Swiss-Prot record, chain A:
The protein, known as: Calpain-2 catalytic subunit
SMART domains: calpain_III, CysPc
Annotated active site: 104, 245, 269
GO MF terms held by the record: calcium ion binding; calcium-dependent cysteine-type endopeptidase activity; cysteine-type peptidase activity; cytoskeletal protein binding; enzyme binding; protein-containing complex binding
Record PTM N-acetylalanine, positions in chain: 1
Alphabetized InterPro entries for the sequence: C2_III, Calpain_cysteine_protease, Calpain_domain_III, Calpain_III, Calpain_III_sf, EF-hand-dom_pair, EF_Hand_1_Ca_BS, EF_hand_dom
Natural source organism: Homo sapiens (Human)
Record's function text: Calcium-regulated non-lysosomal thiol-protease which catalyzes limited proteolysis of substrates involved in cytoskeletal remodeling and signal transduction. Proteolytically cleaves MYOC at 'Arg-226'. Proteolytically cleaves CPEB3 following neuronal stimulation which abolishes CPEB3 translational repressor activity, leading to translation of CPEB3 target mRNAs.
From Swiss-Prot, chain B:
Annotated protein name in UniProt: Calpain small subunit 1
Localization: Cytoplasm; Cell membrane
Ligand binding (Ca(2+) 3): 90, 92, 94, 96, 101
GN (gene name): CAPNS1
Domain EF-hand: 1-33, 47-80, 77-112, 113-141, 142-176
Function noted in UniProt: Regulatory subunit of the calcium-regulated non-lysosomal thiol-protease which catalyzes limited proteolysis of substrates involved in cytoskeletal remodeling and signal transduction. Essential for embryonic development.
Assembly and interaction partners: Homodimer or heterodimer of a large (catalytic) and a small (regulatory) subunit. In presence of calcium, the heterodimer dissociates.
Amino acid sequence: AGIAAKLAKDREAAEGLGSHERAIKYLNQDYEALRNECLEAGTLFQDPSFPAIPSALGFKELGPYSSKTRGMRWKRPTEICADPQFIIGGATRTDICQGALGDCWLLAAIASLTLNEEILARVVPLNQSFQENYAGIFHFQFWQYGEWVEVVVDDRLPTKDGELLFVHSAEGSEFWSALLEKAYAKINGCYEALSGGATTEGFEDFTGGIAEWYELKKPPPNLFKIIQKALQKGSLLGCSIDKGHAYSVTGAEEVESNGSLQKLIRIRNPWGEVEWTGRWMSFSDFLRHYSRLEICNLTPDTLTSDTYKKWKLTKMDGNWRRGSTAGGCRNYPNTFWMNPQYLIKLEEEDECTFLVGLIQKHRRRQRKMGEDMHTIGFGIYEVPEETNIHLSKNFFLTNRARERSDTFINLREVLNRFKLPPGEYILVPSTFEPNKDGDFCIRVFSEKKADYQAVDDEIEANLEEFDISEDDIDDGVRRLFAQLAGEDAEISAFELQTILRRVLAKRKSDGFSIETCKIMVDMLDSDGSGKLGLKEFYILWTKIQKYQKIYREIDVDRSGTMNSYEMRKALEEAGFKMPCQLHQVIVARFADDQLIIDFDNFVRCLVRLETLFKIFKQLDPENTGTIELDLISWLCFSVL
Amino acid sequence: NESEEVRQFRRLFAQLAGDDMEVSATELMNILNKVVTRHPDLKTDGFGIDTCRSMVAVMDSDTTGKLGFEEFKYLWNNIKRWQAIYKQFDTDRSGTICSSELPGAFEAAGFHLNEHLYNMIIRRYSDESGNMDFDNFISCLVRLDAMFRAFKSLDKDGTGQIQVNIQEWLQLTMYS
């Protein structure tokens, strides 16, 4: 684990890793590998990760012991069919269905895929079969919070009386279905977790596009001049009703009878048959259908065609660490400007409009789809006349908004539809209340080219570099030096500790821990001794002097405790500027469980930072931006 | 299939973070100071709130100041791999270690042990006279071990040489 990891995945994700081409390998499992390492063994795969035990099924509900799952037959296609196919051609209908236990949002979600064979090429790696290289293992690619993960699973499916309890085909033979579903259950950690999930969700997972949805009950004015644009783009549209059948909106042209202009809706059914009383639809459908969902798509989906208008796109990542980057909500102006900040600059306009969504990454907590979600939301602000500057409390205490997301939901992903005058707009993703530990991704589907960046600082440290040469002592201080040490008349970490502590009686607080001293020293001991003379000790004393002015200039009490949110400010006073990530490491490595940084740590930090800096600065005498090191040398700096 | 001591600890977790299964440095500290501040044949006042803090940041890949229960195990285990060495080299029961036996416990923890590096250790965790208590001894290895890994991670191929940009640096270095 450790930063090292979250940090080496960056160089890797920056290369390819995650994109379709190079999608991640869930639980570090290799298809080719395992497959190959299963044929040569003469065996059939056996997912040690997602065994065919009860726990894969569920916990409480489809949970063990429970009857819902009691007495079960994990049989593979072969063991129950004859010449099972993985996927054969592209029918005009689906034939798909759920067993007892199965849910039902899979039926719609899967269906669509079926009837757009290239969308299905993204999820199911059409290149598997029960005859050519069969080892009882298949794989699939799923999109997750911004990047593609690859899941390997064995074909043991849960039956009971030769009947498949979850997702399957009416007419046997094909199984890509039941498997892509076993897969998805795995990545989500179990079957029972699919129990709920939004058609709108699992579908983004299956494609990577963005799912916007509407209540036909009370729809928008431009409800129409959109679907057209929708299909027009390549997006997919569905529609359900309080009957319990999921349809598809395959298109709709406003055919004009030159006297009436009777626009129509070309609804379609995945399962084939169609029948009714009305017309296509008399658009009297709004009075007939209850729900509508259009899923605009990530442009590399249709790797060809040149049919359908292709969206534009840019996505970024961000986090909210409690007591530091977790403001969230205009309402809390005491933190809000502390959230992450990103720049979106619209060039030319329509003939701009953009889709913006804030989906929120998984969190240990959550065990079922839909459950345990945070209340995210987001505001966007108008740029007066300007990046390298993380917007301050002032900027928001000022400008009131300029269209803020239409509410904070208690759900994964949040999108809104915008259209704006080709200016630079800023947006502040965040949670409802403040202090909410969690991560996220912000995507953006536009119409024409968009430059998505981030409003934040850069590592910037420039302290006062004094060059007093064993002088500039004012003597009053000089005099008051040697008499503190003794013989050699130098100081030591521990000497410095008592010496220093013995220097207080103004205001919790209790001088500094040795560790601090230990590093106070470390930031100055050049000769490699382990002690300090007048010059450095001077710098220290004075540096301290400065430091201390700030803790106090802010701990406007007698607490000897300052709110973590202060620290950002603070660091600025001490001449340190850093992007969101560090402050987190700074509060994570330095605050309290209550989110208070005592004075000692406050300085243990300021000091240490300066040291590590200098060491870095010093070692990069040319300013290339990188400081190469071998193990040994690394291990030395490493230990503090 | 985990030992009984882990089970009781496991139980101690859910009772804190619940399903979130996480502990904070502080939390980790007592959770640790009550299992080692037990059996007398080993002396110490307990892990200081800084030692735990590195234990936590060193195992933290999401920068939240929390220790996952699985990541906990890893550490705890290593802690035990060393709650030995030390206990074996501190016979004085004074709760420290021989200045010239220090180089003895660190080879009993399997390390390259270089001159320069040594000092570093000595100047950072030992007492005025040159002695290291249980706390700092163990606290050292976590952190040490961490860097041996952080380096192994940053170096995918094997050019026995990692390379970092400043942010990468301040991170590795600052979160420990």
